[PDB]
Scaffold this active site. Sequence first.
Site, PDB file in Angstrom:
ATOM      1  N   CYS A  31      20.294 -70.558  11.040  1.00  0.00           N
ATOM      2  CA  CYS A  31      19.062 -71.018  10.386  1.00  0.00           C
ATOM      3  C   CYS A  31      18.678 -70.334   9.108  1.00  0.00           C
ATOM      4  O   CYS A  31      18.325 -70.995   8.124  1.00  0.00           O
ATOM      5  CB  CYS A  31      17.828 -70.940  11.339  1.00  0.00           C
ATOM      6  N   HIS A 201      12.572 -68.374  13.729  1.00  0.00           N
ATOM      7  CA  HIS A 201      13.243 -69.506  13.099  1.00  0.00           C
ATOM      8  C   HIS A 201      12.962 -69.561  11.596  1.00  0.00           C
ATOM      9  O   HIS A 201      11.821 -69.316  11.104  1.00  0.00           O
ATOM     10  CB  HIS A 201      12.943 -70.817  13.847  1.00  0.00           C
ATOM     11  N   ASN A 221      13.577 -79.026   8.983  1.00  0.00           N
ATOM     12  CA  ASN A 221      14.340 -78.257   9.972  1.00  0.00           C
ATOM     13  C   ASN A 221      15.817 -78.527   9.696  1.00  0.00           C
ATOM     14  O   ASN A 221      16.176 -79.461   8.970  1.00  0.00           O
ATOM     15  CB  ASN A 221      13.878 -78.605  11.389  1.00  0.00           C
TER      16      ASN A 221
HETATM   17  C1  LIG Z   1      17.832 -69.333  13.805  1.00  0.00           C
HETATM   18  C2  LIG Z   1      16.702 -69.813  14.707  1.00  0.00           C
HETATM   19  S1  LIG Z   1      17.161 -71.169  15.791  1.00  0.00           S
HETATM   20  O1  LIG Z   1      15.858 -71.532  16.400  1.00  0.00           O
HETATM   21  O2  LIG Z   1      17.813 -72.266  15.083  1.00  0.00           O
HETATM   22  C3  LIG Z   1      18.334 -70.571  17.017  1.00  0.00           C
HETATM   23  C4  LIG Z   1      17.846 -69.797  18.067  1.00  0.00           C
HETATM   24  C5  LIG Z   1      18.771 -69.305  18.994  1.00  0.00           C
HETATM   25  C6  LIG Z   1      20.139 -69.612  18.835  1.00  0.00           C
HETATM   26  C7  LIG Z   1      20.518 -70.416  17.749  1.00  0.00           C
HETATM   27  N1  LIG Z   1      19.624 -70.879  16.822  1.00  0.00           N
HETATM   28  C8  LIG Z   1      18.322 -67.908  14.097  1.00  0.00           C
HETATM   29  C9  LIG Z   1      18.815 -67.767  15.513  1.00  0.00           C
HETATM   30  C10 LIG Z   1      19.558 -66.444  15.669  1.00  0.00           C
HETATM   31  C11 LIG Z   1      19.795 -66.139  17.141  1.00  0.00           C
HETATM   32  C12 LIG Z   1      21.095 -66.230  17.645  1.00  0.00           C
HETATM   33  C13 LIG Z   1      21.397 -65.923  18.973  1.00  0.00           C
HETATM   34  C14 LIG Z   1      20.374 -65.554  19.863  1.00  0.00           C
HETATM   35  C15 LIG Z   1      19.052 -65.454  19.367  1.00  0.00           C
HETATM   36  C16 LIG Z   1      18.776 -65.733  18.022  1.00  0.00           C
HETATM   37  N2  LIG Z   1      17.321 -66.908  13.730  1.00  0.00           N
HETATM   38  C17 LIG Z   1      17.433 -66.002  12.730  1.00  0.00           C
HETATM   39  O3  LIG Z   1      18.444 -65.901  11.977  1.00  0.00           O
HETATM   40  C18 LIG Z   1      16.169 -65.152  12.519  1.00  0.00           C
HETATM   41  C19 LIG Z   1      15.345 -65.732  11.359  1.00  0.00           C
HETATM   42  C20 LIG Z   1      14.023 -65.140  11.015  1.00  0.00           C
HETATM   43  C21 LIG Z   1      13.892 -64.080  10.130  1.00  0.00           C
HETATM   44  C22 LIG Z   1      12.663 -63.519   9.792  1.00  0.00           C
HETATM   45  C23 LIG Z   1      11.491 -64.064  10.345  1.00  0.00           C
HETATM   46  O4  LIG Z   1      10.266 -63.569  10.002  1.00  0.00           O
HETATM   47  C24 LIG Z   1      11.606 -65.156  11.218  1.00  0.00           C
HETATM   48  C25 LIG Z   1      12.845 -65.675  11.528  1.00  0.00           C
HETATM   49  N3  LIG Z   1      16.544 -63.788  12.325  1.00  0.00           N
HETATM   50  C26 LIG Z   1      17.202 -63.154  13.355  1.00  0.00           C
HETATM   51  O5  LIG Z   1      17.502 -63.779  14.369  1.00  0.00           O
HETATM   52  N4  LIG Z   1      17.471 -61.815  13.251  1.00  0.00           N
HETATM   53  C27 LIG Z   1      18.252 -61.190  14.341  1.00  0.00           C
HETATM   54  C28 LIG Z   1      19.298 -60.213  13.800  1.00  0.00           C
HETATM   55  C29 LIG Z   1      18.691 -59.334  12.714  1.00  0.00           C
HETATM   56  C30 LIG Z   1      19.732 -58.400  12.146  1.00  0.00           C
HETATM   57  O6  LIG Z   1      20.524 -58.787  11.317  1.00  0.00           O
HETATM   58  O7  LIG Z   1      19.662 -57.139  12.673  1.00  0.00           O
HETATM   59  C31 LIG Z   1      20.028 -56.034  11.760  1.00  0.00           C
HETATM   60  C32 LIG Z   1      21.532 -55.890  11.586  1.00  0.00           C
HETATM   61  C33 LIG Z   1      18.193 -60.216  11.594  1.00  0.00           C
HETATM   62  C34 LIG Z   1      17.006 -60.982  12.140  1.00  0.00           C
END
Ligand SMILES: *[C@H](CS(=O)(=O)c1ccccn1)[C@H](CCc1ccccc1)NC(=O)[C@H](Cc1ccc(O)cc1)NC(=O)N1CCC(C(=O)OCC)CC1
Length: 254
Positions: A31, A201, A221
Amino acid sequence: VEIPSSFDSRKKWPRCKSIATIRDQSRCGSCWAFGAVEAMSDRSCIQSGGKQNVELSAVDLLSCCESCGLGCEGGILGPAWDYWVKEGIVTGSSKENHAGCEPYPFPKCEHHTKGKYPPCGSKIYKTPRCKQTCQKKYKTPYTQDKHRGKSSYNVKNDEKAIQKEIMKYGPVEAGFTVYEDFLNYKSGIYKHITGETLGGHAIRIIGWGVENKAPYWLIANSWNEDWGENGYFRIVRGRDECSIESEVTAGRIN
Ligand SMILES: *[C@H](CS(=O)(=O)c1ccccn1)[C@H](CCc1ccccc1)NC(=O)[C@H](Cc1ccc(O)cc1)NC(=O)N1CCC(C(=O)OCC)CC1
Protein backbone atom coordinates in the site's frame (compact mmCIF):
# COMPACT_ATOMS: atom_id res chain seq x y z
CA VAL A 1 -6.78 31.29 -1.85
CA GLU A 2 -10.46 30.34 -1.62
CA ILE A 3 -11.29 26.74 -0.75
CA PRO A 4 -14.27 25.36 -2.63
CA SER A 5 -16.66 23.27 -0.56
CA SER A 6 -16.01 20.44 -3.08
CA PHE A 7 -13.02 19.53 -5.27
CA ASP A 8 -12.15 16.59 -7.57
CA SER A 9 -8.62 16.25 -8.95
CA ARG A 10 -10.11 14.20 -11.84
CA LYS A 11 -12.28 17.19 -12.90
CA LYS A 12 -9.48 19.78 -12.62
CA TRP A 13 -7.06 17.66 -14.64
CA PRO A 14 -8.93 15.13 -16.77
CA ARG A 15 -6.03 14.74 -19.26
CA CYS A 16 -4.15 12.93 -16.46
CA LYS A 17 -5.72 9.49 -16.69
CA SER A 18 -3.64 8.24 -13.76
CA ILE A 19 -5.89 10.26 -11.35
CA ALA A 20 -8.96 8.17 -12.29
CA THR A 21 -6.89 4.93 -12.39
CA ILE A 22 -7.58 2.44 -9.54
CA ARG A 23 -4.71 -0.03 -8.96
CA ASP A 24 -4.32 -3.44 -7.17
CA GLN A 25 -1.55 -4.25 -4.74
CA SER A 26 -2.58 -7.96 -4.83
CA ARG A 27 -1.34 -10.25 -1.96
CA CYS A 28 1.19 -7.82 -0.62
CA GLY A 29 1.28 -5.13 2.06
CA SER A 30 2.62 -2.78 -0.61
CA CYS A 31 0.00 0.00 0.00
CA TRP A 32 2.66 2.47 1.05
CA ALA A 33 4.31 2.12 -2.38
CA PHE A 34 1.06 2.24 -4.39
CA GLY A 35 -0.05 5.41 -2.76
CA ALA A 36 3.37 6.86 -3.54
CA VAL A 37 3.65 5.92 -7.24
CA GLU A 38 -0.04 6.75 -7.79
CA ALA A 39 0.30 10.32 -6.53
CA MET A 40 3.72 10.69 -8.19
CA SER A 41 2.11 9.58 -11.47
CA ASP A 42 -0.63 12.14 -11.08
CA ARG A 43 1.74 14.92 -10.03
CA SER A 44 4.18 14.17 -12.87
CA CYS A 45 1.31 14.72 -15.36
CA ILE A 46 -0.12 17.76 -13.54
CA GLN A 47 3.17 19.52 -13.02
CA SER A 48 4.96 18.79 -16.31
CA GLY A 49 2.02 19.95 -18.49
CA GLY A 50 1.56 16.34 -19.67
CA LYS A 51 5.18 16.08 -20.89
CA GLN A 52 5.50 13.25 -18.34
CA ASN A 53 2.10 11.50 -18.52
CA VAL A 54 3.05 8.08 -17.15
CA GLU A 55 2.13 5.11 -14.99
CA LEU A 56 5.11 4.84 -12.46
CA SER A 57 6.28 1.35 -11.39
CA ALA A 58 4.99 0.17 -8.05
CA VAL A 59 7.32 -2.83 -8.06
CA ASP A 60 10.33 -0.60 -8.84
CA LEU A 61 9.77 1.37 -5.64
CA LEU A 62 8.79 -1.70 -3.59
CA SER A 63 11.88 -3.82 -4.39
CA CYS A 64 14.64 -1.21 -4.77
CA CYS A 65 14.15 1.34 -1.93
CA GLU A 66 16.26 -0.05 0.90
CA SER A 67 15.30 2.84 3.18
CA CYS A 68 11.51 2.31 2.81
CA GLY A 69 10.81 -0.53 5.32
CA LEU A 70 9.70 -4.16 5.13
CA GLY A 71 8.39 -4.17 1.53
CA CYS A 72 5.37 -6.48 1.17
CA GLU A 73 5.30 -6.63 5.02
CA GLY A 74 4.84 -2.79 5.36
CA GLY A 75 6.50 0.51 4.56
CA ILE A 76 7.44 4.06 5.39
CA LEU A 77 5.81 6.88 3.46
CA GLY A 78 8.34 9.78 3.74
CA PRO A 79 11.21 7.53 2.60
CA ALA A 80 9.28 6.57 -0.57
CA TRP A 81 9.00 10.20 -1.70
CA ASP A 82 12.67 10.74 -0.76
CA TYR A 83 13.68 7.78 -3.01
CA TRP A 84 11.60 9.23 -5.86
CA VAL A 85 13.52 12.49 -5.43
CA LYS A 86 16.99 10.87 -5.13
CA GLU A 87 16.96 7.86 -7.50
CA GLY A 88 13.63 8.30 -9.29
CA ILE A 89 11.19 5.56 -10.26
CA VAL A 90 10.61 3.91 -13.68
CA THR A 91 7.38 3.36 -15.56
CA GLY A 92 5.48 0.11 -15.16
CA SER A 93 1.83 -0.99 -15.20
CA SER A 94 -0.26 -3.82 -13.85
CA LYS A 95 0.70 -7.44 -14.45
CA GLU A 96 -2.36 -7.72 -16.69
CA ASN A 97 -1.47 -4.75 -18.96
CA HIS A 98 2.28 -5.60 -18.98
CA ALA A 99 3.28 -2.08 -20.04
CA GLY A 100 6.33 0.00 -19.24
CA CYS A 101 9.80 -0.67 -17.88
CA GLU A 102 8.80 -2.85 -14.90
CA PRO A 103 5.20 -4.11 -14.72
CA TYR A 104 3.77 -5.39 -11.46
CA PRO A 105 4.74 -9.02 -10.86
CA PHE A 106 1.55 -9.86 -8.93
CA PRO A 107 -2.00 -10.59 -10.16
CA LYS A 108 -5.19 -8.77 -9.20
CA CYS A 109 -7.41 -10.18 -6.45
CA GLU A 110 -10.43 -9.30 -4.29
CA HIS A 111 -9.76 -7.68 -0.91
CA HIS A 112 -12.44 -8.63 1.63
CA THR A 113 -15.09 -8.18 -1.02
CA LYS A 114 -17.00 -9.80 -3.86
CA GLY A 115 -16.21 -9.57 -7.58
CA LYS A 116 -14.57 -10.89 -10.73
CA TYR A 117 -11.07 -11.57 -9.44
CA PRO A 118 -10.15 -14.63 -7.41
CA PRO A 119 -10.12 -13.86 -3.67
CA CYS A 120 -6.87 -12.48 -2.23
CA GLY A 121 -6.99 -14.69 0.86
CA SER A 122 -4.56 -14.05 3.75
CA LYS A 123 -1.18 -15.12 2.35
CA ILE A 124 1.51 -12.54 1.57
CA TYR A 125 4.01 -12.82 -1.27
CA LYS A 126 7.73 -12.26 -0.80
CA THR A 127 9.03 -8.79 -1.62
CA PRO A 128 10.29 -8.89 -5.26
CA ARG A 129 13.96 -8.51 -6.25
CA CYS A 130 15.35 -5.10 -7.29
CA LYS A 131 15.86 -5.68 -11.01
CA GLN A 132 16.95 -2.48 -12.73
CA THR A 133 16.23 -4.01 -16.17
CA CYS A 134 13.13 -3.11 -18.21
CA GLN A 135 11.09 -5.89 -19.87
CA LYS A 136 12.36 -6.85 -23.36
CA LYS A 137 9.21 -5.45 -24.96
CA TYR A 138 9.94 -1.89 -23.63
CA LYS A 139 12.32 0.42 -25.55
CA THR A 140 13.90 2.70 -22.94
CA PRO A 141 16.75 1.55 -20.69
CA TYR A 142 16.06 1.34 -16.94
CA THR A 143 18.37 4.19 -15.88
CA GLN A 144 16.93 6.37 -18.68
CA ASP A 145 13.31 5.62 -17.70
CA LYS A 146 13.82 7.05 -14.18
CA HIS A 147 11.29 9.71 -13.35
CA ARG A 148 12.51 11.83 -10.46
CA GLY A 149 10.83 14.40 -8.24
CA LYS A 150 12.58 17.53 -6.99
CA SER A 151 11.09 17.80 -3.50
CA SER A 152 9.68 15.61 -0.74
CA TYR A 153 7.62 16.94 2.18
CA ASN A 154 5.09 16.27 4.90
CA VAL A 155 1.91 18.24 4.70
CA LYS A 156 0.73 19.83 7.93
CA ASN A 157 -2.04 18.10 9.94
CA ASP A 158 -4.57 20.81 9.04
CA GLU A 159 -7.64 20.17 6.89
CA LYS A 160 -7.26 23.56 5.13
CA ALA A 161 -3.55 22.98 4.35
CA ILE A 162 -4.31 19.57 2.85
CA GLN A 163 -7.07 21.03 0.65
CA LYS A 164 -4.86 23.79 -0.78
CA GLU A 165 -2.00 21.37 -1.36
CA ILE A 166 -4.19 18.89 -3.38
CA MET A 167 -5.93 21.65 -5.28
CA LYS A 168 -2.64 23.44 -6.23
CA TYR A 169 -0.24 20.46 -6.65
CA GLY A 170 -2.39 17.34 -7.00
CA PRO A 171 -3.41 14.21 -5.05
CA VAL A 172 -1.44 13.30 -1.98
CA GLU A 173 -0.47 10.14 -0.20
CA ALA A 174 -2.08 9.65 3.27
CA GLY A 175 -1.93 7.23 6.18
CA PHE A 176 -4.88 6.03 8.28
CA THR A 177 -5.60 3.42 10.96
CA VAL A 178 -7.47 0.33 9.80
CA TYR A 179 -10.04 -0.90 12.28
CA GLU A 180 -11.84 -4.24 11.63
CA ASP A 181 -15.02 -2.47 10.39
CA PHE A 182 -13.19 -0.81 7.44
CA LEU A 183 -12.75 -4.28 5.87
CA ASN A 184 -16.56 -4.45 5.57
CA TYR A 185 -16.88 -1.09 3.82
CA LYS A 186 -19.14 -1.20 0.79
CA SER A 187 -20.16 2.42 0.29
CA GLY A 188 -20.89 5.74 2.02
CA ILE A 189 -18.77 8.08 4.18
CA TYR A 190 -16.60 5.84 6.38
CA LYS A 191 -15.96 6.38 10.07
CA HIS A 192 -14.80 3.94 12.73
CA ILE A 193 -17.84 2.60 14.72
CA THR A 194 -16.72 -0.88 15.81
CA GLY A 195 -13.70 -3.19 15.58
CA GLU A 196 -10.15 -3.60 16.91
CA THR A 197 -7.04 -1.79 15.56
CA LEU A 198 -5.59 -3.95 12.77
CA GLY A 199 -2.90 -1.78 11.31
CA GLY A 200 -2.15 1.18 9.09
CA HIS A 201 -3.18 1.80 5.49
CA ALA A 202 -1.60 4.11 2.93
CA ILE A 203 -3.86 5.55 0.17
CA ARG A 204 -4.30 8.55 -2.16
CA ILE A 205 -6.52 11.57 -1.43
CA ILE A 206 -7.82 13.10 -4.67
CA GLY A 207 -10.25 15.57 -3.20
CA TRP A 208 -13.25 16.27 -0.99
CA GLY A 209 -16.86 17.17 -0.69
CA VAL A 210 -20.02 17.23 1.32
CA GLU A 211 -23.11 15.05 1.49
CA ASN A 212 -26.09 16.73 3.24
CA LYS A 213 -23.55 18.94 5.08
CA ALA A 214 -21.25 15.93 5.94
CA PRO A 215 -17.60 16.72 5.05
CA TYR A 216 -15.60 13.88 3.46
CA TRP A 217 -12.32 13.15 1.77
CA LEU A 218 -12.37 11.36 -1.59
CA ILE A 219 -9.77 8.59 -1.62
CA ALA A 220 -8.50 6.15 -4.13
CA ASN A 221 -7.78 2.74 -2.60
CA SER A 222 -5.37 0.27 -4.14
CA TRP A 223 -7.65 -2.85 -3.84
CA ASN A 224 -9.00 -2.78 -7.43
CA GLU A 225 -12.19 -1.35 -8.87
CA ASP A 226 -14.57 -3.95 -7.35
CA TRP A 227 -13.78 -2.76 -3.84
CA GLY A 228 -15.92 -0.01 -2.31
CA GLU A 229 -17.17 2.77 -4.59
CA ASN A 230 -15.65 1.51 -7.86
CA GLY A 231 -12.33 1.41 -6.13
CA TYR A 232 -12.65 4.63 -4.06
CA PHE A 233 -13.97 5.47 -0.67
CA ARG A 234 -15.00 8.44 1.29
CA ILE A 235 -14.18 9.14 4.95
CA VAL A 236 -15.03 11.82 7.54
CA ARG A 237 -12.97 14.99 6.91
CA GLY A 238 -11.85 17.61 9.40
CA ARG A 239 -11.88 15.46 12.58
CA ASP A 240 -8.56 13.59 12.11
CA GLU A 241 -10.73 10.48 11.65
CA CYS A 242 -8.52 7.36 11.98
CA SER A 243 -5.47 9.80 11.78
CA ILE A 244 -6.24 10.55 8.10
CA GLU A 245 -4.94 14.17 8.38
CA SER A 246 -1.79 13.22 10.37
CA GLU A 247 0.63 11.68 7.93
CA VAL A 248 -0.11 13.41 4.64
CA THR A 249 2.90 13.03 2.41
CA ALA A 250 3.76 14.48 -1.02
CA GLY A 251 6.34 16.29 -3.17
CA ARG A 252 6.89 18.13 -6.45
CA ILE A 253 8.84 17.62 -9.72
CA ASN A 254 9.93 21.24 -9.35
C1 LIG B 1 -0.78 -1.67 3.56
C2 LIG B 1 -2.11 -1.67 4.30
S1 LIG B 1 -3.27 -2.91 3.70
O1 LIG B 1 -4.50 -2.56 4.46
O2 LIG B 1 -3.44 -2.88 2.25
C3 LIG B 1 -2.65 -4.54 4.12
C4 LIG B 1 -2.76 -4.97 5.45
C5 LIG B 1 -2.25 -6.22 5.77
C6 LIG B 1 -1.65 -7.01 4.76
C7 LIG B 1 -1.61 -6.49 3.46
N1 LIG B 1 -2.09 -5.25 3.14
C8 LIG B 1 0.43 -2.09 4.41
C9 LIG B 1 0.26 -3.47 4.98
C10 LIG B 1 1.58 -3.96 5.56
C11 LIG B 1 1.37 -5.21 6.40
C12 LIG B 1 1.83 -6.43 5.92
C13 LIG B 1 1.71 -7.61 6.66
C14 LIG B 1 1.06 -7.60 7.90
C15 LIG B 1 0.59 -6.37 8.41
C16 LIG B 1 0.76 -5.19 7.67
N2 LIG B 1 0.75 -1.08 5.42
C17 LIG B 1 1.87 -0.32 5.45
O3 LIG B 1 2.80 -0.38 4.60
C18 LIG B 1 1.87 0.73 6.58
C19 LIG B 1 1.44 2.09 6.02
C20 LIG B 1 1.27 3.25 6.94
C21 LIG B 1 2.32 4.10 7.26
C22 LIG B 1 2.18 5.19 8.11
C23 LIG B 1 0.91 5.48 8.65
O4 LIG B 1 0.73 6.57 9.45
C24 LIG B 1 -0.17 4.65 8.31
C25 LIG B 1 0.02 3.57 7.46
N3 LIG B 1 3.16 0.75 7.20
C26 LIG B 1 3.59 -0.40 7.82
O5 LIG B 1 2.90 -1.42 7.76
N4 LIG B 1 4.76 -0.39 8.52
C27 LIG B 1 5.23 -1.67 9.10
C28 LIG B 1 6.74 -1.84 8.92
C29 LIG B 1 7.47 -0.55 9.27
C30 LIG B 1 8.96 -0.71 9.06
O6 LIG B 1 9.44 -0.62 7.95
O7 LIG B 1 9.64 -0.96 10.22
C31 LIG B 1 11.01 -0.41 10.29
C32 LIG B 1 12.02 -1.23 9.51
C33 LIG B 1 6.98 0.55 8.36
C34 LIG B 1 5.55 0.83 8.75
